[PDB]
Amino acid sequence: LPLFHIALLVLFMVIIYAIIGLELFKGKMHKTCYYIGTDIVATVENEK
Amino acid sequence: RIKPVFIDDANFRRQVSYQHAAVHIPTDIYEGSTIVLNELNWTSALDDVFKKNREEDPSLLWQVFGSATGLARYYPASPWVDNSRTPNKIDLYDVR
Amino acid sequence: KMTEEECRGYYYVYKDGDPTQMELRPRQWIHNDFHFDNVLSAMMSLFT
Amino acid sequence: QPKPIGVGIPTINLRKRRPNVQNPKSQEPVTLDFLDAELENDIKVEIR
Numbered sequence: 001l002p003l004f005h006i007a008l009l010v011l012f013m014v015i016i017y018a019i020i021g022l023e024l025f026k027g028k029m030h031k032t033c034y035y036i037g038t039d040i041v042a043t044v045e046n047e048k
Numbered sequence: 049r050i051k052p053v054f055i056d057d058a059n060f061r062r063q064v065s066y067q068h069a070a071v072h073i074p075t076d077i078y079e080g081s082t083i084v085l086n087e088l089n090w091t092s093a094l095d096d097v098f099k100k101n102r103e104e105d106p107s108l109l110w111q112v113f114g115s116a117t118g119l120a121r122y123y124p125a126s127p128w129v130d131n132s133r134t135p136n137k138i139d140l141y142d143v144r
Numbered sequence: 145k146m147t148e149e150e151c152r153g154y155y156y157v158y159k160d161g162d163p164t165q166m167e168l169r170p171r172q173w174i175h176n177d178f179h180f181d182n183v184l185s186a187m188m189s190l191f192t
Numbered sequence: 193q194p195k196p197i198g199v200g201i202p203t204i205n206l207r208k209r210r211p212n213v214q215n216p217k218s219q220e221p222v223t224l225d226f227l228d229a230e231l232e233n234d235i236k237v238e239i240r
Contacts, residue, residue: 035210037206038211040160075154075156076153076154076155076156077153079153080152080153132168133168137214138167138214159210159213164216165215
């Protein structure tokens with residue numbers, strides 16, 4: 001019963017940061033390093 | 049190892065050495081197991097038969113003993129077409 | 145390979161899990177980084 | 193001739209072939225039937 005206001009303060013910080021990130025980084029992480037003329041994404045041993 | 053002399057021949061469009069027999073071991077088989085080093089120890093008695101077969105009929109092409117451990121001992125000695133990693137083409141040849 | 149006498153030589157790895165796209169790698173008997181051999185190593189591991 | 197016997201039509205996928213992965217070449221024998229090396233009559237079948 002007492003943890004109400006803190007949860008209501010977290011629910012709006014998540015909502016504010018979601019909208020900020022939606023403004024700034026929307027549709028930016030969509031290109032990557034493919035092999036030339038291929039659909040095999042190029043990485044190294046431990047690189048995601 | 050052995051550093052062979054490798055004259056160049058016809059009847060084999062490559063360079064062969066009639067002095068000893070060459071050995072092929074699959075790439076993913078260690079040469080240095082106890083099983084492999086025991087096949088290389090008793091197959092060394094084949095080279096006299098290899099040579100005698102070849103001297104009775106000089107028109108004879110490869111002679112090979114392909115062993116059940118992966119080895120292939122052939123005569124006359126001649127470098128394998130593919131070094132596994134010295135060029136970027138690795139070879140998958142298993143005698144079995 | 146399960147003992148150090150077997151873990152010698154080379155072996156094939158398959159990229160993307162494809163049986164026709166392989167690479168040679170020397171195989172080596174590797175020790176973990178946080179192991180439990182002595183009590184100092186066990187204590188480091190338990191710390192992490 | 194000194195070339196492998198072909199089966200079907202070949203279809204390669206460029207977009208799935210890494211540049212340096214050493215795909216195997218061939219191991220099949222050259223088994224060319226008799227009635228596929230000449231024109232096939234009803235008499236050549238009986239000779240065969």
